[PDB]
Paper text:
Xylan, which is a major component of the plant cell wall, consists of a backbone β-1,4-linked d-xylosyl chain, which is decorated with diverse substituents including 2- and 3-linked arabinofuranosyl moieties (typically in cereal arabinoxylans) and glucuronic acid (notably in cereal and hardwood glucuronoxylans). Of particular interest are the arabino­furanosidases, which are capable of removing the arabinofuranosyl (Araf) substituents from the 2- and 3-positions of the xylan backbone, thus opening up the xylan backbone for attack by classical endoxylanases. GH62 enzymes are inverting and thus do not have a suitably positioned nucleophile.
Here, we present the three-dimensional structure of a fungal GH62 arabinofuranosidase from Talaromyces pinophilus refined at 1.25 Å resolution in complex with the bespoke iminosugar arabinofuranosidase inhibitor 1,4-dideoxy-l,4-imino-l-arabinitol (AraDNJ). There are two subunits in the asymmetric unit with high structural similarity (r.m.s.d. of 0.22 Å), with some conformational differences on the outer surfaces, in particular in the region of crystal contacts. However, this structural Ca2+ ion (which is close to, but does not impinge on, the active centre) is coordinated by six water molecules and a carboxylate O atom from Glu215. This is different to previous structures, in which the Ca2+ ion was coordinated by a His and Gln pair, which are replaced here by a water molecule hydrogen-bonded to Ser278 (in place of the His) and directly to Glu215 (in place of the Gln observed previously). One of those bridges the A and B molecules in the lattice, presumably aiding lattice formation, with coordination from His180 from molecule A and the amino-terminal NH2 and carbonyl groups of Ser24 and the side chain of Glu220 from molecule B. Another Zn2+ ion is coordinated by Glu88 from molecule B, His180 from the symmetry-related molecule B and three waters. d of 24 ± 0.4 µM. It is rare in glycosidases that iminosugars bind so well to the glycosidase active site without a close enzyme-derived nucleophilic interaction, but other examples include CAZY family GH6, where cellobio-derived isofagomines have been used to good effect, even reporting on the substrate distortions involved in catalysis. It demonstrates how arabinofuranoside mimics lie in the active site of the enzyme and how the enzyme recognizes and cleaves arabinoxylan.
Numbering used by the authors:
A (entry chain A): 25 to 325
B (entry chain B): 24 to 325
């Protein structure tokens, strides 16, 4: 395939959807291709600043996202991750703020927002130094193990693992810290991907900059190994105001790179890098929980 | 944040930060937490007869304010205390010696009130052999799996007990396991244990008796339930002591607490900003140990 870029630059769409009546924001997207169409799950914020979740109706082209249905989940699955777990032929939805520190549900009908199984434990542990507690999971496998990565709004990235034959199931309560920095430099919204054909993994993490939210990147040769800084500063980031080509938003915030293969390896084609991110109008302000986040798409330049 | 521990320690120091109120001769064995952005310090007292009790200080924002903070006597003593917030059950804990059990604890939702604590409960009900004092100087620390009790015996040993985190608050029982052994003077008392922020590592400090005064030695571990390895191991190159403190008002660097920013049961220290609230005494002081004029000072890494 293609090696990761040494230096990142992008072009952007404008906003691709707006929240339906009774909602103020669409956040934290997770995307898969399902039956040749785009299947997107995400969080919601309502007029009171309370968080829930949803999916979009299946849509073929990004220009059609604005007319897709917005389907409210009856029990919330905030900051979701969706993937197909191939060894047991089942789709997985992982999330925070449910009955366990992280939870999951299963389905064979993932286009139905309300077709998921009863919640099961994904992780039951704790962290310290945090105003939020554990936040923003992702889940990724290799041929031997499944891995859980997450954040804490506290400058740390955490990891747990289990044998692949034990999944779906709980990772337990123990974790290991894999990265540490200032709170603003490693804040939240971590994502991890297999770089197709390159024997390498990509991690991206949301940071708080002087000029907006932006992403930093790291690389590894194994999911249980060391993470090395790649695009590390606000002025030369993975994706941010400095290199996004987006003028409708300053923020490039919590979302998902575009994955074509929907399986548990979270594989990206680095010949065709694209980023489904949350942004907000440059004129927006006030209460964080009421900010009008909505989706946009970056394509490498 | 996530700095590695230093390989080698050296410090600068304040002078005395506070002195005992009328009727007391010493303030000893501090335990500190941040409570709503302010410094909350508990400690032992020695009175004009050399008898031991406990107290807290009024809440204060800056170390320069400690000398004018109220000194609030506890109606029932909690000698050599440990204070922390037990997050899983949303409650503050005060652990201590010389009460109704070998080690005891009380609970509170109002920890700034010296006399607002619940009735005493058992923390530990065992004994140790070959000690002139019996069990002394507890601390309590958790990870994601278990809570741990560490303590000393004025006898060259450090002791450990443990329980599942879901069983706490409760008693650790009566059994203990010896994790370190040396001469009485090399591993004497005033043990403290901390999580090194971001490092997947733990730090233990222990008070020792040197030629030139009291000083601290250090150890590290990769798991709280595992083996402890010596780090700073001599009086001339200590964790903290006369050799490296930058303090001239005191020779002793004795029983206190590293500065913890997060108040919870993990006892986390930010190794980018190491500071030590220690007990010291005037260089011209002397005589009976129980009457010594111990009082607080603060080290900052140099
Ligand atoms: O949108 C809900 C939370 N907001 C910050 C974090 O990235 C999300 O989990
Ligand atoms: O200050 C009371 C005791 N004195 C020695 C020991 O470190 C303390 O528990
Ligand atoms: Ca996410
Ligand atoms: Ca102590
Ligand atoms: Zn930190
Ligand atoms: Zn003040």
């Amino acid at each position: 395939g293609c090696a990761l870029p040494s230096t990142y630059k992008w072009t952007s769409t404008g906003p691709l959807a707006s929240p339906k009546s009774g909602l103020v924001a669409l956040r934290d997207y997770s995307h898969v291709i399902y039956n040749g169409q785009h299947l997107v799950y995400g969080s919601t914020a309502n007029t009171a600043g309370s968080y829930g979740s949803m999916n979009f109706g299946l849509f073929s082209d990004w220009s059609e996202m604005s007319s897709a249905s917005q389907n409210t989940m009856s029990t919330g699955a905030v900051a979701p991750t969706i993937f197909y777990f191939a060894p047991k032929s089942v789709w997985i939805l992982a999330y925070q703020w449910g009955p366990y520190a992280f939870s999951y549900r299963t389905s064979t009908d993932p286009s139905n927002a309300n077709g998921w199984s009863s919640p099961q434990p994904l992780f039951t542990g704790t962290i310290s130094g945090s105003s939020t507690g554990v936040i923003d999971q992702t889940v990724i496998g290799d041929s031997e193990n499944m891995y859980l990565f997450f954040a804490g709004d506290n400058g740390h990235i955490y990891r747990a693992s289990m044998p692949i034959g034990d999944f779906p199931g709980s990772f337990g309560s123990a974790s290991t810290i894999v990265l540490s920095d200032s709170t603003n430099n490693l804040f939240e919204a971590v994502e991890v991907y297999t770089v197709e054909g390159q024997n390498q993994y990509l991690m991206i993490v949301e940071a708080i900059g002087a000029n907006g939210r932006y992403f930093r990147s790291f690389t590894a040769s194994s999911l249980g190994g060391t993470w090395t800084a790649q695009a590390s500063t606000e002025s030369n980031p993975f994706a941010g105001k400095a290199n996004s080509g987006a003028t409708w938003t300053n923020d490039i915030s919590s979302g998902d790179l575009v994955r074509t293969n929907p399986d548990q390896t979270q594989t990206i084609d680095a010949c065709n890098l694209q980023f489904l991110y949350q942004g907000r109008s440059t004129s927006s302000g006030g209460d964080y929980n009421l900010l009008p986040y909505q989706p946009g798409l970056l394509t490498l330049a």
